[PDB]
Amino acid sequence: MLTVDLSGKKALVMGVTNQRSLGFAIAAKLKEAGAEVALSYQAERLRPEAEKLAEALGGALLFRADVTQDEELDALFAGVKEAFGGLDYLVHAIAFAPREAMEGRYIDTRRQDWLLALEVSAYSLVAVARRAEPLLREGGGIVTLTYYASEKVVPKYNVMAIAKAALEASVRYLAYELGPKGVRVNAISAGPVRFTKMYDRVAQTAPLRRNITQEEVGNLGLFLLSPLASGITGEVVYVDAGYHIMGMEL
Amino acid sequence: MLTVDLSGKKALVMGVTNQRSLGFAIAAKLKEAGAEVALSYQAERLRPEAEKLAEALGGALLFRADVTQDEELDALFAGVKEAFGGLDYLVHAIAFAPREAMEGRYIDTRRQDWLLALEVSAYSLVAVARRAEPLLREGGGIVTLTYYASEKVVPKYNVMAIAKAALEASVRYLAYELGPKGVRVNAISAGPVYDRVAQTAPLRRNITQEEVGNLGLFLLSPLASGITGEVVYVDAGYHIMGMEL
Amino acid sequence: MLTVDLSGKKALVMGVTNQRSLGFAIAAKLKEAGAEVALSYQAERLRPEAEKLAEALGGALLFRADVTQDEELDALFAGVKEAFGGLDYLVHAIAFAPREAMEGRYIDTRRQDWLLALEVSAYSLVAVARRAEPLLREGGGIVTLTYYASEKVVPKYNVMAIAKAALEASVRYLAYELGPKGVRVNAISAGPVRTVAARSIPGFTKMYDRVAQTAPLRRNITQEEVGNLGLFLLSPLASGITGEVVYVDAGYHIMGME
Amino acid sequence: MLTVDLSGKKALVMGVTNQRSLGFAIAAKLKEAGAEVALSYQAERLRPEAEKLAEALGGALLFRADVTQDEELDALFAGVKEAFGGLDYLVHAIAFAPREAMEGRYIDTRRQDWLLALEVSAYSLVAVARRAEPLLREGGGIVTLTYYASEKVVPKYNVMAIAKAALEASVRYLAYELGPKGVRVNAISAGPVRTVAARSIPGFTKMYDRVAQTAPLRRNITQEEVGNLGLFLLSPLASGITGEVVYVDAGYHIMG
Ligand code: NA
Ligand code: NA
Ligand code: NA
Predict the structure, then answer these.
(1) Cα distance between residue C217 and residue B181, in whole Å
(2) CATH superfamily of domain region C1-258
(3) Helix count and strand count (H, E) for chain A
(4) Taking a contact as any Cβ pair under 8 Å apart, which residues of chain C between 218 and 257 contact chain A?
(5) What is the DSSP-derived secondary structure letter of residue C152?
(6) Does B118 sit within 8 Å of A111, measured CB to CB?
(7) DSSP 3-state assignment of B232?
């Protein structure tokens, strides 16, 4: 048997607002493997849900920070440093675009909505990576979540596609800049996890003839963060039941 | 011989500040093929510079607009509509990142610098495409300029790499949204116009600005009527190489 | 207006058997631009067919060679040297897979069928490039045809997809090796066009209809759109472009299946 | 802690001739995780070599087959069926190109040499996948090896690059065809590792030097790193992943 033992390792998991988060899936696997987890939450009004998520994980530390606020990120990382002493893993599961941007056409995206989507969904990785850098230990890593709309047109994903392209390019640059410290940076491109017509359409065309599960994403994040992935950096790894390899729908 | 005659066609070229640039090179080829050209310029203090460019093209209408200002973009397109009645081609040659962002490391990029780079270098394509849409005639097109750092890490290109990744994704989505009107949207990924590029590139030389101009002309012309959503590399083959020579 | 004038230029166009073909479309644009054309034909039994093609182009020189026979390729290129003195352009429009391999599943492909498909559809480019090399003038080039199935799974395209993957990789290596002489090598990735070659692909009517409905332009491309890209790539207007796979597919390949 | 327990699982590992190989590294991680391994070997004169590999793994069944011989592959799979009943994993670590093809220029590759390289390095995956199909149990998988030269020009990788391009396209089509049975197919794109196979690639040494100098991690990868990725991909931890080319290269291929 192979064992993955992450006892003594420290993870910060950002962007989790409910148990269906792919981020929650990864945090759950990290806990199961033995790591200690800190969860960020956006604002004090959301602390109750954050407390519920921490209890759902069997225990986690909470910190308040809005990723648009540089001081609040500074305070978060000061808190992490004091509580953990250092960091091994950062899970970035932050994704946001204004509802108005996601309705209608990409060409019609308003300036402030476009910039906020990019700020929250892409720049946030840079902002947290920079602050994590002095805390991250050798062998440590950052993982983010993406979707294949970065490369292929998925109508109505709109500015989020563009944010994901910016996020994936960021992963590559950050991998180059963090690599000398022995810190790796990767993205997981996930398929949908079970509206119903969309899930069924994906399932008919995917090679595996089904949708992926939350646990499948969790397992890939565990692997990438673990020492089993020590040679892998700068990569976008697809967990999508093979869907994106298809050149037409079935 | 085959001839491409773009007489009667109307181009707006944006982002051009100098005769030795890729946007200028495209504008010049559009003129040579017979098109009329309007150039944008960013601020009225640059009017003299714009005038010298227009003269170097043998004549070009000039319109002031800073692409971060929606009201100014509205005014520009109202002006183009008034002058031309409609539009055939839009050349987006706008690229900017703050000096501080381009010094040092990408991970150290400041928030406002990052956003400004993305706003000017990528969002501007969306802002101008939306305003061009109702003016653009069947057969019309938009072309923008990019660089292979969108896909590969080029140290010191920093946030501009990320902006180009956003720009190329924008090209794909805009191609999808403008396709029903018979309007095409493409990107040209150019090499530099150094000795290391020449040593590694298959052609063992750098590309010229005229080579970029010719590709832009081809993409906007009817010869390219089946091509949309593409990133076409004009780089002497450099980017196909899996290591430096 | 821009003019494209290729008078005095010499083209060898290979793999063409019908006027409704991408290879013929490229040859037609080359002739229209002013170049002289040579067409290969596979065996003396197909000479009549080749003669009609030469006539449809308003005049072309013919040479016999089967692309699986190295000695016949040596003979064809000796003939080209004697008749033209040198060569500017080579259009590689050769594609073939046995119909036994094209029906059913890729995993069921027979050994000899797979090898022949790769031999005719990918190795042929290497074979002809090597022999064209000493004849190819500075500014010259080679263009081949490919399809999106090389990159993404298109049901029923089977071993032809794998052949096209091999062909595209060959384009990059050949661009690297021929570039220092000023010779360019590129592939055109065409969308579906009703040609006589399309009848040998079991996936066609279904993809052709899908493309019209899914592609950004909301239509299929035409053979003339392919000919025009071929003309551009071979012309001096594309002098900075080499090692590329350029798509002329109405934007189909950029789409997600939503 | 989490545990990957492959007890009761059965692997067939093909192309392995030396402990210093990526194929061997994957076989070793499979053994560590609890799977039983069978190794193929090409020719009976190589039986002693194969026996030493089996002992280095702590035990493996051995089967003779040359992947260019359809009859031999039929006999191999009959032997595997009789021994194991079924199969869970197939590791395709077969690669070959004639020396003459690998020396000098790609453009100068001779016809028979080119075809043999494609036959052994790419068609073999199809040949073995077809025969494995009826044996492979739900949750099962096939993994193969590739490298960046398939996508970008690495001088003097020549026909091996083209064969790897053919192999990666084959992975995608096979994933599509085997997926409805619940069988996954993936490729590992390894950085340069000093293996026995590395000796037959003239372009290897320039790449090996370049990776350590310029990759994000500023080092080359190890065969164990490839072994761990192969183990992950075959394991149930990767149950959502199919038709992929996953890079384990210290980030090299992302660099400009
Ligand atoms: Na909107
Ligand atoms: Na800076
Ligand atoms: Na050789």
Answers:
(1) 8
(2) NAD(P)-binding Rossmann-like Domain (3.40.50.720)
(3) 9, 8
(4) 253-257
(5) S
(6) no
(7) strand
